[PDB]
Amino acid sequence: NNLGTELDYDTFCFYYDWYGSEAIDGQYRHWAHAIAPDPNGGSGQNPGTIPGTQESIASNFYPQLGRYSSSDPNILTKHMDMFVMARTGVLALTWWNEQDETEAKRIGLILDAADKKKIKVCFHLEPYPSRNVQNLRENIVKLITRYGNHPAFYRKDGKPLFFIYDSYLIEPSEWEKLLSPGGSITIRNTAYDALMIGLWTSSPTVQRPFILNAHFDGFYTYFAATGFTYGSTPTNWVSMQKWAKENGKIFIPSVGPGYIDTRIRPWNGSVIRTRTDGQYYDAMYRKAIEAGVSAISITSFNEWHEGSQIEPAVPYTSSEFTYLDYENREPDYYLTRTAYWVGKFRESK
């Protein structure tokens, strides 16, 4: 078929499976959330918590699907149908190494639901406690062993792919052990080789040697808020792509529709980026495509705490909070607008 509706398998959408519902789980997990203390504020902050009631959830927006469980197979079905609407072929799943049966169940449910719609899944390896290159290798081995034969397990030219959040927390000298072909615990040329995509944060003076010396296969930028880092400043993307191409690296810039996290981080208002009826998303996605990249990542499907979600949101005013909503756009606008941009990306590829 040549309909202009097919999934794109170089488009990665960051997905969070940490929500919990009455129907499935037993606490309204993540809809209830601690309010972060101000890192520059007084001593003796008791910032409190958002209780995750119908009226008061840990987001500035309100989901169309309500306080859903990420363990609810009927929610997962709906989510995969939303990925199909958006034309996003890869779900980049947050992964926290919880070592619990409920996590294992959820991952399996997600892979199964994804496959019914021909969506692929890769892992977004988060900064779990004492993360280091040895336990990262062990966990890569476990994920490939457990899930590598699942038909929804993502591969690019035969290789799995991982995004590594806050990769700068591990020194390049440690990364080299895992990621250089000569490294003492290398995955290169093994059954567990993978494309490893590190997080480009700050200036080229710092990031270029970091990426080279760490032996990452590529880099992404994550943040939906323009200007939050050098990497999330889209005017830098042409130059970042040129460097990537020169150095055999894969650049996967991250685009998002807006940012606001002030329910959980009330002190962080300077990072707010207004959606402007889709104009912010349009501008960011255009810059990614114009940079001439081979792959794009979307922040986010459903990071509701950070207000970067493309998942449908609805107007809601409760006794406790007046939520933001999609304004003059319909709840599914960011899904259909994603599909528009995926088409533009494909036209350029």
Ligand SMILES: OC[C@H]1O[C@H](O[C@H]2[C@@H](O)[C@H](O)[C@@H](CO)O[C@@H]2O)[C@@H](O)[C@@H](O)[C@@H]1O
């Ligand atoms: O401090 C608020 C800030 O926190 C989180 O990002 C942190 C870290 O994970 C990032 O690597 C660096 C990049 O410079 O920034 C923080 O230290 C995110 O939640 C972010 O959106 C938020 O503004």
Ligand SMILES: OC[C@H]1CNC[C@@H](O[C@H]2O[C@H](CO)[C@@H](O)[C@H](O)[C@@H]2O)[C@@H]1O
């Ligand atoms: O997936 C990368 C990155 C996205 N932003 C949130 C990060 O997770 C932290 O913040 C969450 C609230 O926004 C909180 O629920 C998590 O426990 C974690 O502190 C995530 O690493």
